[model samples]
Structures are given as structure tokens and as C-alpha cells.
Target: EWGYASHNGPDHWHELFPNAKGENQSPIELHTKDIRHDPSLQPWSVSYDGGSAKTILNNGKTCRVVFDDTYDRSMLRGGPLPGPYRLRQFHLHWGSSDDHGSEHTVDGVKYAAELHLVHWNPKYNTFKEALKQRDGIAVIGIFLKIGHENGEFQIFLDALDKIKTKGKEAPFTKFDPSSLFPASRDYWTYQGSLTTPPCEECIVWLLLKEPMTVSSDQMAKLRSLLSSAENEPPVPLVSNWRPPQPINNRVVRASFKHHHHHH
Candidate 1:
């Protein structure tokens, strides 16, 4: 399958998934000088029903927490989204070391990790149908820094123990993902595509400015996960993130100005 390897990696994905080479692919560098402080950008909002959380699984690509998105029970609205987008799942990307691993970088700084909460527009009949539209998906990206032990994050880290290897899955419910967000609602929004295969240009990217902390020990636990199956040779699931793609002159809008920093 397509991965962060040399042969079947990001560079080679376009050969199979043509959109991998799309002009508006995601995980782009967010340069402060390149962004526009827009007063029109609305304050971000999220309403998540903890009961919507379904299961957690190790899909080899990344550890994902799936939610019951059969309806609009949990939703993310405001910000750059035109309407409420139901939360579908959330996953993470990280490196072997804490120095750098996040997909999107800010002013040339890369964080220890990144979390993606994927959502789809309610106007679409199904996520599969939404994938074909330019404005069907919305993704919230929260950067993760290595520092204190985040209790909120600990809940997710603890689930990793059960899904240590690829294909492993465990029940995960009553989890309110909004609790994991940082104190700041400040963010940068831009139009981009999915970072993976098919690379549909449907994402309305919302990247939080302030990063939440996760202890180094917790990060180590994430690295301990294996991408291989139970019967295959072990392969540590580290550095599963894709590199920042070209901006291609896309205008990134900030919800708040530089002076209005959220502490």
C-alpha cells in the first residue's frame, strides 16, 4: 500500500493515485508572512457527543479513533466551514524521535506530532460521495509538543496498548475529542486536499496555532507501536507523516491577528 517509504511512498503514490500529485495536496507549510489576517474568519466551534466515539484501531498507516458518523450527532462548525461537518474519525502522525514529525509546519518549525480530526459535510449523502466534491471535507489539525503529561491525551495513549500491532482494534467509547483541543481557538485555514491516497481536494483545513503537550514518555509509547501484522516481522510505526507540500499560492487566512494571541 502507499506509505512513507522510498518505493511505494508519497513520491510514488501519484503513479497509482493520480491525485497524490494534485496541485492542492495537503500538509503545506504555513508561513506567517504568507498568511492573511482575516477579520471575516469566524471563531472555531465544536460540539462532540462523547458517546459518538466507537472504536480505536491500528490500521498500519496510523492509529485511528473511529466515531459513529451515521448522523450529525457530533459536529464541528464555524471557522472556515460553511456549515456543520460531522466528525468521522481522528488519527495521529509522528516520528521515531520527538524533534520533528508533524505534517504541517509553521514558520519553519515542526512539532513532535500532529493530530487530525476528520469530518465530512452533512450535505453529502455519504463520505464516499463527499470525496468527489471540492468542499466536502473539513480536517482539524492540532500540533502536539513534547513536554508535560496531558491527561486528556493520556486517554488516547492508553488505548494504544490494546492496538499495538496492525489490524488490532479495541472498543473506545464515550470519548469527547473536543476536550483534547488546546486552550487557544486561534487557527489558520486554507483549502487543501487529503494527505493520503485519492488525495481529493475537499479539505477545508483548520490548523490550531497553539500546540498541546504530551510527555516524552508518552511519545515513546506511540513509537513502540508496530506497523506490521501479528505474524509479520516487526516494523516500528514511526515517522508515518508526509512532508509539507507546495503551497501553490493558496491564501491562508488567520482567525485572529498576531496581537490577539490566545494564551
Candidate 2:
């Protein structure tokens, strides 16, 4: 389900289509640069033991991660904040083509890829238990722009060779996601649901206004993975992104200050 085929492609997701909830229809006013460099925010950490990309189930579908409150917490969706949520699982949403694919938009612009770091309310007994609560999840999204030059994403792309085929996986030993974070953390915060099915309305989305750039070749390699079966005609899953939904009169807001100085 985590690979390029099946429950992963935008074209193949019709049966389990996601709903754009009323609360998520509007956009927020953002002060993205300040938040990206904020020092008061908690530091993030994650761990992943790679899996396969072929049969889909062999991939890292069962992989799990945890988030902590080294970062500051804010109330973008509801009212006064309880606290910063902790990281839980990290995943992605891509396209069958590389031209355009992403969940959130900045100033009406779309990018090639979107990476999500999912978190949950630590106030609950555990992350698993928090999933059922309304405020149980928070997802930080970073957009990826594709081009020829090698920019800040070489590290992430280096791991792709190990996971080139469907259902294939390798031990992503000592992989630290923070190393790939952009110099800034400023973002547009809002209330929304998971871009995928069930589209739970429990997420507090902090989407970075700036994006990380990668090489065009690197992107093509990622697209090289198949989203369809060999029996069917070959097709790429590079354009798995959901189209930007209409703003249902909702407002997305940005933080008043930046916090990346201390780090």
C-alpha cells in the first residue's frame, strides 16, 4: 500500500476516494519563514527499518516511528493549544507522473512531491491510543521541487537505489530525517484531514512555505518504480498527488515568530 501501485496512485484511488472536509476547504495566511527557523520549537527525531517496494506488503508497510515534543505547539485548527504533538509515522503521496503532485499549495503554486511527518497527542496513554482522539495527529509537510542540479535532497535519494522495485526493502540503518530539514521551518498551519482515505479530520497541518530541490534524474529514478502490474501495460506512478481543494471559507494562518536560531 505504501509503494507506487494500488492504494498509492491518485488515478487508482477512486474506490477509496478521500473527502475534502468543510473545515479543510479554506486556506490560511502564513508567515512560513519565521516558523522554519524558530528556535523555541522542539527538535524532531525518527527511525525506520527499510522494507520492499514490490508486492507492496513486503515494503515498509508495517514500519512504525515516534515523535517527541522538542518543538513548540500551536493552535492553528481549534482553540488554545494543549501542547506540541509527538511524531508518529512518516510517509508520502506522489504522482504517476513527475510534472505535478502535492497536497498543499503556496501562493497557488504546486510542487513535485510532498513528505509528511505524522504525529499524535502524547497526552493519551500512547500514540496508538491517541489515533482515536480528535486532536491525536499532526502532520508536517515539506514540498520537493525537481530539477537537474543536486540540491539538499541527495541524502534521501541515495536510499532510493536500495528500494527501487515494488515490495522491496532494506535496512535504513541510522537514517536521521532531521538532517534533510531545510534551513527554515516557517510554515502555514491549519486544520485538515489526511490527504488519503478516511481523510480523518484530526490533523494539525504545518506545511512549509519553502521547498527542497532535487535533480530531475533523481525524480525519474523514483518514477521508475511501477504503480501498475507487469501484466498491465507499463505506467509510471509519478503523478499520485491530489488536486488542491476549494477553500470553503476557511482560514490558514502562520506563526508570529521564527524559532530555528537556537538549533
Q: Which 10-residue window of candidate 1 scores lowest in summed lDDT? A: 254-263
TM-score of each: 0.96, 0.66
Candidate 2 achieves a global lDDT of: 0.52
Off by over 4 Å in 1: 259-263
lDDT per residue as tens, model 2, 31-145: 2332233333343333322221111111322212232233323112222235645544455555545666666766456677777877677677675666556667877788877
Task: Name the top TM-score candidate.
Answer: 1
Whole-model lDDT, candidate 1?
0.90
Residue 186 in candidate 1 has what lDDT?
92
Candidate 2 Cα misplacement greater than 4 A, ranges? 1-81, 96-98, 147-152, 228-235, 256-263
Q: How much lDDT does each candidate structure score?
A: 0.90, 0.52
> What lDDT tens digits, residue by residue, belong to model 1 across residues 219-254?
998899898899999988998888888888789999
